Symmetry: C4
């Protein structure tokens, strides 16, 4: 007491449903009296007792006078913040963890590990925090743009596993994994296989033995690089997802990429972080994923699922499981996370819904949550409700 | 450590008194600096250590720019929120539990169960949350409009009981009860008797054996359907309240519905959720109710009591027990709840006091609280103090 | 664990010093973004682990549109609120305990007892709350204006003692004391002696055997009625303070009231709640008191002290101990309270500094605190810093 | 349960890195809805479970109407406030500890000791608070201007050590040390050596036996007086730092003060509080310092380190260890502090970054934090991001 946490069997269920919308800019009107933080790249991570809603803030509020620059990704002001999930992340509700323009976090059963990358592009620095204490750092190994998941890391028996990558956004970016224990990096993991470009991995436990991630290739393909990480041997291998249902944005028509599973295909350049989460059952594994409704634009978000098989080798289309966000609403980064029920884990997907009015106004996001619950089919979609002119 | 909660004997007392007003829009002036949430359908539920003040928000604040739509009931933005009772439910104080346009919640002695219905009208979805975890769902069975109590559910020995209903607002709505244990629906209960139309049940423990509810018939009668639910056999029966003191709004004159207790009578169309709470004594049960002072309008709120007898068979008027809200002030939904003292339970009735300026402006509500305390007669009424023009 | 608290010997020291200013209207400008609550009658009460700053709010903020009425004492909106001492009592920081236009509170070692009087003037009602639960009430016994201390009640071995009074503001008001245990009134105490008019008692422990109070006579004298309450026999006696240093406002010149100690003297009509607190030493008792610098107006506040003797019988002038508030700053109600150090009690006096611009604007107060600390003499005075035009 | 705290070996690491910015005035726009407090002289102190971010407020917010006076140092409104480190210090987040225009604070492993000086210049008063209780005071001994550290005090085994000083800002200010146990001054320590002028000491543990301080001489020299305080014998000695790298501002060129280590040299008038913190290793001690990048202005802040030797006798330059704040940004007071990891201590330096637009506008500050973490070289600087016109 407290004990290390481990992945458990998932809670019973067979469909996702609309759970919760965090839409702080519903309160950002000039007529209003609130101060929602301007953010992007939200994610959620849960421990034994609570869930935290994290994001990267531009250290500015709406309404405010610092909108200029909020459409960019990196600067000296960007910070990793969080609130307890369900609270509106305002100036006062939020806590500022560390300076960061790329982030992650995960609870190991005893304490929170927070991860923030900042610094100049060519020599950025990953900083590790354990509770209140800054405990370790890790250096840029390709001197291009060291960065991390923008979603939860994953802990088992006190060992927290984290994806990082470094390299050109439009070229080679070979990722690695760090094994972090009580805030200190105790092992590096160098993946083999199809390693050309892997970033913004969304990772979870397929079992006590294996972590899988669905990631983004920003240069070469609209198929998602798919990591299989063995946590017993601390080794990782990556291959493209073979599914005809290409999960990236942009992407070509489903199934249109000819040749073997590793064929890159058309419209590979560009990308989006994608949602992915495991439903671990006694004798099968459900893999849930999300992608935009639009093939080319960050609009809408659909849910998909496949049980079992080998994602590296199966071209089978994923089963379309419902519209979480209609194509009329923005659908940007998405991520997986799991909530800890008393005796089982509940898989969820979160969706960043960015308010984009161009660089001439503020630029921020709402966060929508869908979770496995009950049976049947997914019933309702999510709108942000935000009018950017107000 | 902790243990399951059970209803106890009520604390001594023989009259209700004005306890507390939560009037958030006292701070919603355009000249002000506050952000009260636009809400309706408030209710309260307490556990061993705290009381939570719940409501359904339209995800908008006053002052703000999203007033349009706030007089409606169902949309994709409504959420179940809560604060600790005594705190002003603002943007920042509140926590958002889940997407919902109909709600309930209750503590079982160990944890909170949160209940929220959303989805499309003809295929709505009840969602169950236990602590942070989404644990179960229940589907529309009439495919008309699945909905729930808008007040506390009732747990005993870990089993929480909840009214749901489904059907046309102007036709048949046959309710059901769900037995829910640690977030999971473990039994469905199909009531017998007068089941024609039952919705918005206000329920509480008459004893360790019986839950009773005072509900709303929105189409056929101004008498309230009265549920008796046997918690040992998990069976329920419903009959109209026979009291001449009809508790719904609108309603005809007291005693004017002639014939046997089950006669429906006139002005049965329409209705209102009604307050109801038990005073449990050693060999005597007090039943306390509230109804608007106006027969046709949602204005005022009066308190009533009757001891013992059979509400199904007794035509005698309930005893008038004080003006909680004068006819000059709004009196909308009302509900019962119990606060846990060290060794006994304190029964209370809460009153939604809606600020209604029609659809061209904001639409929200204050909450007044009356509790059993001391002896004598109820001494003072409650006003919201809100000028909607400000 | 936890244990009942008892008064202990005071911490070492021989002078008071400026400790803390709570001045919420420093943040109430129309140019600002805060919401301090409009309040009056502040007081402080401490338990084993924290101090709470209480006050009676008009349920309105500055800036705001409900200034009209905030110069009055009683209405249906007035509420007892509190924050942890050191926090600014704004809309969001404060917690609303109960409806009340007269108040008190005290911790008994295990739990908080909150006291609120509301209702119509001729039949007001004292309500008792223990933790979150409403537990008891007490009725108007003179049907004129039931009211209470506007400062902390006093608990010993679980027994909490409270002054109340009832009667005309300009006539007879015979006070009583209630003995309250775990939120329920278990004994009434009817004082003997000079009982004509006693209100707004400021009470504390002279020892484990005796509570003393310095109170206000609003009709007959500028001497303060002085209560001696024996907590072992639950009996109380009241006599006027004999000191030439008349502690009320208005008052005549010091020492100018001729005749025996009970002589009423000139300028008896009108009054002000006064500060009073005990310094309990091994073999002597220090009584600390406060009164306005002005003889006739609520301006300034000076500190006074006398060790030992019989306040009923000693005409000796109190030793003037320093200016806490200069005569250029407002000085309204004042009160005593004690902070619990690890092994000893620290005596303090708090001062209500009202911002009074007349009934045509807002009307509220800052709170200044002085405490026994170290030796020597009192060094610095307190200003509110507030410009009422902003 | 809990036990007294002691300094431990420092966590491993060999460079500082940018950790966290607290820039409250990023939200202080007139177009905004926030209320950052106007503050100066921030510092940080951590205990076993949390770090507190302290400052001295002028009891005014931005935006607000009390800017006039905020560029001054001493008045009757200044207060020591704090938030949990990571929270934005606003009107509502902050807590007000006591009236003070000079401050300090530290945790002893069981409880917080708060230190605040106020009163008139020629008769100021140091006040000690332990938890909620005011426990002790210490009087002006030179009757010129009693003042204290503006940074954390240092506790070991329950004994907390604190620098105080008193004297003319432009003449002799002979400091003293107070030994404080559970809020009470149990010993005075009179330093020997070069005691001419010592103020604003930044102190920390070199070991279980020795506290060291880097201080400010405001009249005679740009070398920092360096205190060595033996905590076992309770004796202290002071000598100028001999390093060519003069740490004060203003200062002449490095190494340009000729003669023996004790030579005062030129441009000694004026000064600035300087950062200083220990890296304790098994057989090696790291001393980390900060000084402005400008020789004459409060602009920029650079980090420096030197291992071992005797700071009193060593003229060798400290090693430059990175630009924490470039010369383009304000660099005012700086201070050291330590965060408690599970088993080791993390040394940090904080930097006050003042927003100075002169006396015709508001005057306040951000706080930048750098901590020991990882290896390599310090990688990124800090900006406030504040446009004072907004
Ligand atoms: C992963 O391993 C953990 C630890 O072995 C498994 O958790 C245990 O499950 C058993 C049976 O359910 C319990 O009796 C233990 O108390 C659990 N250990 C704990 C809580 O620390 C977990 O089930 C495994 N995950 C799987 C099999 O998916
Ligand atoms: C309902 O049943 C519960 C459980 O049997 C009763 O609670 C017990 O009350 C007795 C004293 O009356 C206590 O000594 C027990 O410790 C209680 N048990 C629990 C589990 O709380 C409860 O009193 C019953 N309620 C009514 C109204 O009779
Ligand atoms: C009032 O009575 C209480 C209870 O008898 C006294 O508190 C005790 O003091 C002794 C000696 O200081 C301790 O050993 C006990 O533990 C205390 N009892 C507690 C803490 O419950 C208290 O000193 C008395 N007040 C006086 C004498 O002024
Ligand atoms: C200063 O002294 C304390 C107390 O002796 C040291 O703390 C102990 O450290 C050992 C291991 O190094 C632990 O096993 C003990 O439990 C610790 N005791 C306490 C009371 O904390 C501390 O290490 C010393 N600091 C330095 C820098 O040597
Ligand atoms: C508010 O929204 C509704 C959509 O149902 C629309 O019909 C109505 O015109 C809107 N009101 C205004 C003022 O635009
Ligand atoms: C601010 O206050 C000072 C008092 O020291 C006064 O001299 C000055 O004129 C004031 N400024 C304004 C703009 O009134
Ligand atoms: C910010 O926007 C302004 C307005 O066009 C532009 O002039 C300026 O160059 C921009 N600066 C940055 C850093 O984006
Ligand atoms: C409030 O003030 C207005 C303005 O003079 C006055 O007309 C009205 O009678 C007042 N009402 C109350 C209740 O004080
Ligand atoms: Ca791509
Ligand atoms: Ca009806
Ligand atoms: Ca008088
Ligand atoms: Ca100098």
């Amino acid at each position: 007491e407290p004990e290390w946490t481990y992945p458990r069997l998932s809670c019973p269920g067979s469909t996702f449903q609309k759970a919760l919308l965090i839409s702080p800019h519903r309160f950002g009107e000039t007529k209003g009296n609130s101060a929602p933080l301007i953010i992007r790249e939200p994610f959620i991570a849960c421990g034994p007792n609570e869930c935290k809603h994290f994001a990267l803030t531009h250290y500015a509020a709406q309404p405010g006078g610092y909108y200029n620059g909020t459409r960019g990704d990196r600067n000296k002001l960007r910070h990793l913040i969080s609130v307890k999930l369900g609270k509106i992340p305002t100036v006062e509700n939020s806590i500022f963890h560390m300076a960061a323009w790329s982030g992650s976090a995960c609870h190991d059963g005893k304490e929170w590990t927070y991860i923030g990358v900042d610094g100049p592009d060519n020599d950025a620095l990953l900083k590790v925090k354990y509770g209140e204490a800054y405990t370790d750092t890790y250096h840029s190994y390709a001197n291009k743009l060291l960065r991390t998941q923008e979603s939860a890391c994953n802990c088992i028996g006190g060992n927290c596993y984290l994806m990082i990558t470094d390299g050109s956004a439009s070229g080679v970016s070979e990722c690695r994994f760090l094994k972090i224990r009580e805030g200190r990096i105790i092992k590096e993991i160098f993946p083999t296989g199809r390693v050309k470009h892997t970033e913004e991995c969304t990772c979870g436990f397929a079992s006590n033995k294996t972590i899988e991630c669905a990631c983004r290739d920003n240069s070469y393909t609209a198929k998602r690089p798919f990591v299989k990480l063995n946590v017993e041997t601390d080794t990782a291998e990556i291959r493209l997802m073979c599914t005809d249902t290409y999960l990236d944005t942009p992407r070509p028509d489903d199934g249109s990429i000819t040749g073997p599973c590793e064929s890159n295909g058309d419209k590979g350049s560009g990308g989006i972080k994608g949602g992915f989460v495991h439903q671990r059952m006694e004798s099968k594994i459900g893999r849930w994923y999300s992608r935009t409704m639009s093939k080319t634009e960050r609009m809408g978000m659909g849910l998909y699922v496949k049980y079992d098989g080998d994602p590296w080798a199966d071209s089978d289309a994923l089963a379309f499981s419902g519209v979480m966000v209609s194509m009329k609403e923005p659908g940007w980064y998405s991520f997986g996370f799991e909530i800890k029920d008393k005796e089982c884990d509940v898989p969820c997907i979160g969706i960043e819904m960015v308010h984009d009015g161009g660089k001439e106004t503020w630029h921020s996001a709402a966060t929508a949550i869908y979770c496995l619950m009950g049976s049947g089919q997914l019933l309702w979609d999510t709108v942000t409700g935000v009018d950017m002119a107000l």
